[PDB]
């Protein structure tokens, strides 16, 4: 009975730790995604404007 209780408690703790790690990773990846999106927009508009004013 103690073994089963310990097994279920261990599963609960391990799963909540995994969920917290996943949430932190999601936050960091979202920050990276936003930075990449801004950089892409800037590069695209700069190239378009350079091509336009090269005429």
């Amino acid at each position: 009975l103690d073994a089963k209780a310990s097994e279920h408690a261990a599963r609960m703790t391990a799963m909540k730790n995994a969920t917290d790690n996943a949430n932190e990773l999601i936050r960091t990846l979202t920050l990276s995604y936003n930075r990449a999106r801004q950089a892409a927009i800037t590069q695209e508009i700069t190239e378009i404007v350079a091509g336009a004013n090269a005429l």
Binding site: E44, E47, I48, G51, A52, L55
Partner: protein, 240 residues
Amino acid sequence: GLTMAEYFRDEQGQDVLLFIDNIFRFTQAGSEVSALLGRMPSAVGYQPTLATEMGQLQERITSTAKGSITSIQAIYVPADDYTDPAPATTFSHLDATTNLERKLAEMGIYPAVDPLASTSRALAPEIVGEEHYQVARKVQQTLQRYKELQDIIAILGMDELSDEDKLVVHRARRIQFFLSQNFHVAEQFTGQPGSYVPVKETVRGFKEILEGKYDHLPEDAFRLVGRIEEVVEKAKAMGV
């Protein structure tokens, strides 16, 4: 080429098969000449007149009262990006769409047609038949459901699954491998001559697989078979 085909369409009332190779090259050359023609650049470096040129080319390939032209066109997707302006613009002109996936190609499945992304407006109950529509929709739903289970299996293993999704995945693997076929032109690549499968036998085989008539057969027996008798023959030759 289109001008050569239109004569047979109009002046003789024939049925014309217009096989056009990569459309993407036409748009690419149009964009290559654009900057030297003196025109301003566009979103992804394409010419401003991309859609107008594309439509002026494509609208001439149509069936009329005099005759019918059917066209099969290969379209290159740059770096697998389906949001690229040229493939994105090409979609508006097509009646049926066949999408090829590198994931299916690497796994060993050919023609590697994506069973979910491919679309056709001819897939209607009044066009192909109610039985055909039922079989196609059931196959698509089974594959979509199986795709969902893979996310769970990748973490928790197969054993954690229940006994109905077990059957679902066990039949979805069979369906996915049976969607493959050995081509006549792939003989140079594999050494195995190709096969021609009529649509009636295709529907019958897929319906039998969905009903589980061949559930006992090994999974690997369904790869590159053709008809539904050939998978049984392969299973016989390799044991079961």
